[PDB]
Amino acid sequence: VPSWPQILGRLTDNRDLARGQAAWAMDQIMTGNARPAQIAAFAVAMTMKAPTADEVGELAGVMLSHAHPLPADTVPDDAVDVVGTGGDGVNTVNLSTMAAIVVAAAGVPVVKHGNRASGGADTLEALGVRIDLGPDLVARSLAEVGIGFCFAPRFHPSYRHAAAVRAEIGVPTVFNLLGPLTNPARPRAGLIGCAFADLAEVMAGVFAARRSSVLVVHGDDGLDELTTTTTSTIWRVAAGSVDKLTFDPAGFGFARAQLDQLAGGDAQANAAAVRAVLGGARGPVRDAVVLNAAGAIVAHAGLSSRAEWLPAWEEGLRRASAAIDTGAAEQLLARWVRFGRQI
Amino acid sequence: VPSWPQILGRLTDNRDLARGQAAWAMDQIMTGNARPAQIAAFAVAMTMKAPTADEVGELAGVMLSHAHPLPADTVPDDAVDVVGTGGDGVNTVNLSTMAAIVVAAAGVPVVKHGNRALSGGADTLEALGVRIDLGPDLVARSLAEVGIGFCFAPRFHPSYRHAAAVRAEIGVPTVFNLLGPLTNPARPRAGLIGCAFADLAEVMAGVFAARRSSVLVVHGDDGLDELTTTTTSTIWRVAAGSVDKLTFDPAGFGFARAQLDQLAGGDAQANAAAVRAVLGGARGPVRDAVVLNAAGAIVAHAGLSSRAEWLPAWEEGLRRASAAIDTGAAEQLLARWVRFGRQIL
Ligand SMILES: Nc1ccccc1C(=O)O
Ligand SMILES: Nc1ccccc1C(=O)O
Ligand SMILES: Nc1ccccc1C(=O)O
Ligand SMILES: Nc1ccccc1C(=O)O
Ligand SMILES: [Mg+2]
Ligand SMILES: [Mg+2]
Ligand SMILES: [Mg+2]
Ligand SMILES: [Mg+2]
């Protein structure tokens, strides 16, 4: 029976959708069969009717069902993502991009997913990295360099109609959740930042369903990363289940920082901040990077059922600091740049 | 300062808009400055937030400021409308249109707003041979010469085209579905106003209240945007700037309960035939529902005077509506309206 009037009516009636309806809607959007007004009505209605983990999972499933995959056996079983929803309002340095490099340098394979804004892809581009690569070359980068970056428009070309609408309406919706949930390499672990405190649990539910080992993180100051200005909320996903924790990095010797110390402007500035940290500059920015890099490593450790929380953090922090201090992180970036210049 | 992200963000945060924001939005929509996605987002977000009468008033106000007006001093001060939201999802006969003819024949000036839709009011008028395409000047002359005029929504609100398109693309009812009955370009002060959506009728009433109209906003408890004979109706009575909610039972005035299928409509030709049968004096449930709705419009008209009393008003309305059919006045008025249209220019 499925139709726009039926699905929209159910949503405007403040009712959860029936199984399969969110999937039908998203597939319409992804096959160029939904009008801009229909896309917009759906995105808004699905946000104002608080979306469920099942519903958001259906949306992400449809997108992944249409995306370009990586080739068979090119993504190690233990690869990790480090990524956020964005839209925390705060023009920060790209902590996720910095932490990703550090995590890769430490020997954990990283496949990152992202897009232009300031933003993650922009900062990478300004550092000289090729953000643009197709499946076969992203697989090569992962093999040879230890990190890869899937550019969203390259892998999700059928999302362009939905992307054009998000822009036109300019307001956050349920679609802002989809980036971290639709990494086309499908890594099973991640450190995932969520700007929308109310929706982080929903994102966690989605990861739990696919039995990922993920830490979904929201700084109690609003950051879509682990913060050093105060405590963070963590939705810890492992063994298909979610528990909510408060996390205080003071317990690992981290000084309280002020939010303005993690601020960064254009792609050029954030690129300078990356070089500064990877070059060994001390300060609040390094601390944040190390903390979030450790978080990603802890998420990676969680793939093993024998993993323990506090020992995992201590080892993650040691490994993250060493990766920077030895120059490994700095040199991984240099190798990543070199890789892109050599077909 | 005003922008789409600001207004839609406020709405998706479940907040009422600031004074003037809804007006800004509607004006962008009516000037061709809004993308279909923005129109759709706004209509939906406002509906799910729960629109206020201030907000709906602002939307209707912008529309009326862009509409083609009727010439000055051509609409009597006591002219009435008989019109509904539609969207009740039950194909009925054209009760508001039939009632409008009867009310005019009773001597109450009627300027009806309407649209095409099954067969909407405008479709059925066309099938009867009445002109639904007249501009402001000729509608004013219909009113003066025949006692009734019809304002076809698209002809008077051409700048609403972008919004009407989006409404149709998304299908789901929204706050926009309220706007037809609130935006009669002749701006009559009284009306019998149907609302298919029980949860929005009170807000419609509030808008009419703010304008100091004398209106009965009606919702059949069976779902119809008409006063029903099938069961009770909820009526938001608007007079003297204030609204109070009543339940109306036709059994109180001797009407038997009808079944909904007795009121069911068909194509425009079938619905035109149904109008002719009622105006010709056929008894039965359709006549009953027409007389009841014509009476309501006459009660709204009486309400323009603060002297009006509810039960005498309804008894006089019912008398007057019944007599207008029985004397042949209603039938003759329709013939004269058709003739008027055939001899223009
Ligand atoms: N902006 C995007 C994000 C994801 C997929 C496609 C696009 C696109 O622009 O086509
Ligand atoms: N907003 C995002 C965040 C992360 C990855 C992709 C996207 C995207 O725009 O599709
Ligand atoms: N559907 C409407 C509602 C109000 C005013 C005009 C129209 C129209 O279609 O022109
Ligand atoms: N229901 C109406 C009443 C009058 C004018 C237009 C409409 C409309 O919805 O298009
Ligand atoms: Mg991030
Ligand atoms: Mg960030
Ligand atoms: Mg009607
Ligand atoms: Mg009706």
UniProtKB/Swiss-Prot annotation, chain A:
GO terms for biological process: L-tryptophan biosynthetic process. It catalyses: N-(5-phospho-beta-D-ribosyl)anthranilate + diphosphate = 5-phospho-alpha-D-ribose 1-diphosphate + anthranilate. Anthranilate 1 binds at G84, N115. InterPro entries: Anthranilate_Pribosyl_Tfrase, Glycosyl_Trfase_fam3, Glycosyl_Trfase_fam3_N_dom, Glycosyl_Trfase_fam3_N_dom_sf, Nuc_phospho_transferase. One of its GO terms (molecular function) is anthranilate phosphoribosyltransferase activity. It is an enzyme of class 2 (transferase). One of its GO terms (cellular component) is cytosol. It comes from the Bacteria. NCBIfam families: trpD. This is Anthranilate phosphoribosyltransferase. It comes from Mycobacterium tuberculosis (strain ATCC 25177 / H37Ra).
